[PDB]
Amino acid sequence: MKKTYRVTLTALGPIFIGGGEKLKKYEYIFDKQKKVAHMIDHTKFTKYLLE
RNA sequence: ACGAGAACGCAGCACCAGCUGUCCAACCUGAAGAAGA
Numbered sequence A: 001m002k003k004t005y006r007v008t009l010t011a012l013g014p015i016f017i018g019g020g021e022k023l024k025k026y027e028y029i030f031d032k033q034k035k036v037a038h039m040i041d042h043t044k045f046t047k048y049l050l051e
Numbered sequence B: 001a002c003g004a005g006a007a008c009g010c011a012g013c014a015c016c017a018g019c020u021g022u023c024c025a026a027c028c029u030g031a032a033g034a035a036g037a
Helices: A041-051
Strands: A028-030 A037-039
Touching: none
Parallel strands: none
Antiparallel strands: A028 A037
16 A cells, blocks of 8 residues: 655755756856856846836 | 219318436556766
């Protein structure tokens, strides 16, 4: 008979799996001043470009 | 100078009454973004 054993994932290491791909820095910011990176949303960017 | 002549087989009348094209059934099965960029 089926049972229930709850399991967790203490991902001590960083993870990568594929769901898609993106090209060079045309919609994401790769800063180097304070060493941070950024990825954009969609709707706010659309409104920003509209204005 | 016909066993003759004259004489609508015609008049009234709903192929109609009741009746679920319904019942059961999963659009379901099997299938890593890796890899020497």
